[PDB]
């Protein structure tokens, strides 16, 4: 599992960050502090943290991942890591 | 357990003998001419107007869905809507909007009226009207997405309040794409704007 | 006997007991977090809609009548009013329209719109609410006429009946010269049909 | 002999089969997912546009006449109504406008309502359903005059005749002073007008 | 293979009987002076309610394409149509919009309208009618993108379901740029809009 | 003798020619690819504006009257109608009000509209056309009276003038009590007018 | 070579002549009081019609053409134009939108007048002209955009087709900007809209 | 002794001095940076609300009366006016509509206008504004009527009395043929109706 | 300090004191039948207007707050409201539209109604208004966002200024999502458009 | 073919995911289980999968792919990569 | 010339791809089968291509050209490209 | 604390230039010369500068910081910074 | 100075190019032949130039810059870059 996707959404400074889907690395998820839950209406779980997205990238950092691209979309701030 | 036409004429006298105490308790004397009747009257509207309690969305449900391979967005807009305020017990009108995008499944024009029934006759709260509609349609199709928006005049604001009748309460509930793709949620919006 | 404040405190709690009975006679628990306080709430708003029987047209009288030499007709249009059917105990509203011939004494618009306020909060009937009207003004002003007329939609048959809001019940009362000479009778409603 | 209960369901399969017959009849295949319930579909609606049949103006009548010691005109107007035409077997809808002079006799919307209700659910002619109203509300009450009119688009030129749904059809039924009285006439023409 | 005049003409007195035999089963007696008549008239109509079977889009085609060197957006909106619910039988009236990204080759407006009608008078599902439509246009066309929008009141909830001529039902195909691109979209929705 | 098919057919070709020579006339190429096939459509269309001629109040008169006994004003409102101005060949767009008071017979839908589109699809003059509607409509029902209000835009006016589409023209017919008594114009003026 | 008052006066006759055949060719005597003098009429007019063709943009051009040094969005709307089917010589009406982003020079309101009406006075079709009165414009100021959009009702479709003067027909060309910035086009859209 | 540009300076203070009062009898600190100009322009705009009272209709009158030889009714409708209720000093907005039947001479609109804005500006009560209106045109003109009539929304019932924006209130004054003939009574409030 | 019913009557006489001064200093005679108790009556209703002052949100706050696990837009719109104008004493009134993003906590109508009223009825500036109202939803509920929109006709541009009551001044308070989300403040300012 | 574009609409944490257009590679096509079709009124084929752009992003390391950019146009997120 | 544009709208599965401006190098056009032309009302001549943008992708691979980024605006998706 | 999230809003060549959320280094953002507040309404505190991103970007290299990623998101312009 | 930031807008295959903002260096801005202004109502002056931004991305390779990053945002295409 090399690659690892987080978004925000509105503002940058501030949380939740979206840290994983239904597939993600439950003990990665366990680490970074991350709940999981399925927003009614939602056909998918997913895991957030409260942090904002520079703190989880910093924590990303740490566990051997790199940001190789960050772009927007609607309004949401998205960050492809991958590690190694 | 759904409440039942036994239930209500097994009750109807105690609501009829409430109304005729309330009648004395505001200075009224509930053996004049117009007023003998209305303790049953009233008590019989009182009913009518919960009478969502005796169903069920199974009631409903199979009875009517229909596989036409659609998968675009539908929408019933203007419904008419009478309901209950579980606060003061007076009623507020209104209008209620439907839209969704089936995955194949579609609902008949009946079924969806007939679940607004449901839920609109009985007490209420409108944010919490709102929501069952759109789990309701949700549940009874498993469509891609599903919105659902109320707008309704509160008369606990019009006689009440002080003389608010022009005020206007808007909820809404957005489930699936209609929650998540901005695209979709103006579109529905835009359909049933005008 | 004009109702008072001390017998609303001291009916209160008969209301707010009613209520809690009708709330289980239809199945709900009075207990739900937010059914608590509907008893109460359901009976400060019964006496609201009632509060036109602590009062009486002398309190109004005259307060406000004043003399202006005038004797063409004088009209106020589009009253909104909000009364109860003492049939079944559902409201029903809409506006009303007053005009009268004055004999060189004018009524004031507050005095006026309590007058209005006084006869329909409380239980009636439209026929009669606007014969009240009629006369009051009557009395107060020993006009050389006075017509008025209301419009209201009664709730009883939008949500009840089967769903007939459009539905609009219009009523008159012609005194006086309203009553004898058609060519006033007309330019009345001529003043208020726009 | 008005129908009842038991003579619809004796008679929904014949119905059934005079439909299943049509379908067959126009090009269809009776056995489509979506054309199989429709025969029977089709007829319980025939049956519900026609169940004024089952009625008579008697199961309403006393049940809901008041005395309210009033002597002017009452008007109940924008009543929507639905009904069958006679001579195609397509509905034309409208709204009917109803005025009378009480002769002391008042009587309940939801009565007037139902007696509109009981002749226009039945296979009719607009000119027929006005002066069966009309006639209705006489007998109910002896008043000192009635007047009916309904304004109604009539399908069979909507969509037959060519594309005429703009098209409107008035008529009016005018007893007692509403037929000797032009001013009565005149009011009661106003009142409704807007 | 479509249905044609002879078709017609050898199946007219099955409808009449059919329609004759209906009639009784409601409690009509098919001899009165004014339905003696109807069994034919009634037959008459609903076959033109679905002489669109008798059609193909084909004898439309070719006809009436021309090229105008047009690459921008084209649309017609506001085309009344009339459809037969294939549920209940009973008829649905409304509006139909078109809009299409024209790839060198343009559609005259009565080829348009005739494709409309062809597939409206006939049994239908709006969602089909309207799915039917974009398709014939984009096969008639070769286009880079087209829209229908169809809003539409469904008799069968105006009379029956209870009163709710009110309600409208929108549907809508976009196939090609108006499926893809969001701004084509909302430029056609913005169009037919007001 | 009533204009036929044939008749068209054989003159066809004629107007055709006529039409491909004003093309010319006008500084056209008849041969564009646009032009080409435009003279005969031109021409079928000038004949479908005066289709009203290979026809009679004869062909329409009996086959649709029946006796419902009924001695009330009936008014049909809004009939749209299109026609030519025999003075400059343009067409004038409208809408066609009609009332009558019958003797017993009334006149079905479909009749009276196929009265108004004879006699205006045909070269006209709007206060001819008035009048031969309001006389077939007498001679078709022998009534105490009827009544004919047009309004239209004239195209020649609109275009031509200067630039005059606001304009309206509005004629009428009385006859009968229509015409003597003022009251019966008054309300049947009053009928239309909203 | 643009059309002349000469070319006219040497045509008009020919207009008149073949008009005057298509009078007999339907039927009418060009003898009658009446129509006598149509074929002239009717000559006149269509000519009126299409005196667009002895024009250029030229004879408009710099003639008022004014440096304000403006670089923001300019619009014209609600402008209303006459046009001509080149398919079946009946005219559609409708109003003309236009809008174009300066590029410091900017164009007078009569010139842009006569623009429109070069191009709508002579047998069109609506795509076309659509484009024409964009080029025109592009052309005579080299703006930064330019945007284009006529709405109208076409009267072969009114008439004929059936019955639909409802339709509407909407065509649009976006050049510059206005077809790159979807924002532009957007705010343009909506300073029309209303 | 008409109030004049001196009193007014002489007075400012005076005025600016009050309302400083009423600021701090209120509760607010007359220093605030947003409330220290505040008296003198509270001062200034209740100077210009009355500034009626420094004006005589003789500083209209002559300056423009034209022969015209006309005798038949002029009118001038919906006129703004604003004015001062003498009872709460708030303000009533409203239109004044003026008519007459001229024996020759004929009034300007600027001084018809500055009639209405003279007796307007300055503490009132409609019945007297109304009637004033009406003699000072009476006097200006020697006319063979004159009719007036207002129709306003009076502040001290759109906030105070409770929320009535909604209500108005109509006054009239009808002098000569406007009083003793009702066909033109009926005229003027035709021909200002709509 | 909050004001109290104490301050008012101390008060009282203070005011009427500087209203009696203001009428003198006008030009008129406080004497006058009419203009006696003004002074009174005019102070009354300049405390009314400021009534706000002797309130605080606390009074209002927890005393209705529900939970409903809710955490949708809700949206109250066309809310009536009147204030005065710091600047010139003279009444602004408009209408407030509301909106918020509940964090599971609600507010009830009523106590919504009161924040607005509290601010309102004191000496304004709508901007400041806007903003109060907005805080103060901020604070009764801590939602994720709330949005405020007013929209108000101020008095001293009707009459003074010229004549300009057309002018409508709007002005808003995004906080939270409202603020930094686009497409939120775009849904709300869609279900408050129309 | 050293390039390939994939891609997801309104939400990252589910599909389906867009793999391939008419031109593609048949064999790497069938490696993801991509299904083929060509949307109603759309001149062109495309091959998509149920698998959200993250797992289909791991799948395409495997055969050589790498993330050279990721960006968002409308309501579709999209990734740019590349093999060698 | 070290830095080329290219772009494609509303769908990148499909045409037409937009490969250069007026004062692109004449030669790489050619060898793409680029046309040329000045849409009305534009101020400006245009290069495309009717082949997806992927296709055009690997086509200038094979002349030198690497991807440095991708980027999304407006219903526009462009990608950067840099020689040597 | 290896990435830093910088942006700007409708312009580029003017500020106020956003360096930093509630947990950023009180040394870097006082080395910027960045103010903090929290906007009525948020519940969250942001460090702005007054200065163009550009000057910004410049002073971030100085400290040790290289762009890995600009991207648009809504009307506001997102730079993602990494250290070492 | 070792950030730059160009933009255009609309169309890419057309300029103007924005190139510089007011603390831009002046040579590079000459170099470029970049004009300076102030739009009616702006708070600020702006540097730009004729030319299509990739005319202006070769002109600046050949100054030492390279293009770090490219992004869209609203209708504005921006490039981030760096010299050394
Ligand atoms: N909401 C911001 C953009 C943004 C969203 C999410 C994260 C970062 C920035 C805007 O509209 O400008
Ligand atoms: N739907 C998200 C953007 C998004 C789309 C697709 C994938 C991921 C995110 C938004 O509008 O904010
Ligand atoms: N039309 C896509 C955006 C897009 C444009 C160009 C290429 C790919 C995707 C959307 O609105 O989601
Ligand atoms: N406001 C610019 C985009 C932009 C925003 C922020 C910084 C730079 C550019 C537009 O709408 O095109
Ligand atoms: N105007 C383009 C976006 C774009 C902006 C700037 C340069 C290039 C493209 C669109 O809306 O698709
Ligand atoms: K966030
Ligand atoms: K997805
Ligand atoms: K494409
Ligand atoms: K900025
Ligand atoms: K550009």
Redesign the interface.
């Given at each position: 599992?090399?690659?690892?996707?987080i978004?925000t959404?509105?503002?940058?400074?501030?949380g939740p960050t979206?840290v994983?889907?239904?597939?993600s690395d439950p003990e990665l998820m366990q680490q970074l502090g991350a709940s999981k839950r399925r927003?009614?209406?939602?056909?998918?779980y997913?895991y957030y943290v409260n942090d904002?997205?520079?703190?989880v990238?910093?924590k990303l950092?740490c566990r051997g991942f790199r940001?190789?691209?960050?772009?927007?979309?609607?309004?949401?701030?998205?960050?492809?890591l991958?590690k190694e | 357990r759904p409440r039942s036409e036994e239930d209500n004429e097994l009750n109807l006298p105690n609501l009829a003998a409430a109304y005729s105490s309330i009648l004395r308790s505001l200075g009224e004397d509930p053996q004049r001419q117009g007023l003998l009747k209305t303790p049953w009257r009233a008590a019989t509207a009182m009913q009518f107007f919960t009478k969502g309690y005796q169903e069920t969305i199974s009631d409903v449900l199979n009875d009517a869905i229909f596989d036409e391979d659609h998968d675009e967005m539908v929408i019933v807009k203007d419904i008419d809507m009478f309901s209950m305020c579980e606060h003061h017990l007076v009623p507020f009108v209104g209008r209620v909007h439907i839209g969704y995008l089936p995955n194949k499944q579609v609902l008949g024009l009946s079924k969806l009226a007939r679940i607004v029934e449901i839920y609109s006759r009985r007490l209420q709260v409108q944010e919490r009207l709102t929501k069952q509609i759109a789990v309701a349609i949700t549940e009874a199709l498993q469509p891609a997405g599903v919105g659902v928006v109320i707008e309704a005049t509160h008369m606990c604001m019009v006689m009440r309040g002080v003389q608010k009748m022009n005020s206007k309460t808007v909820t809404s509930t957005m489930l699936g794409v209609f929650r998540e793709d901005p695209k979709t949620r103006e579109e529905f919006l835009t359909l049933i704007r005008s």
């Open positions: 599992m090399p690659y690892l996707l978004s959404q509105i503002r940058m400074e501030v979206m994983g889907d239904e597939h927003v009614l209406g939602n056909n998918f997913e904002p997205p520079r703190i990238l910093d950092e940001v190789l691209s960050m772009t927007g979309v609607g309004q949401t701030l998205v960050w492809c991958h | -």
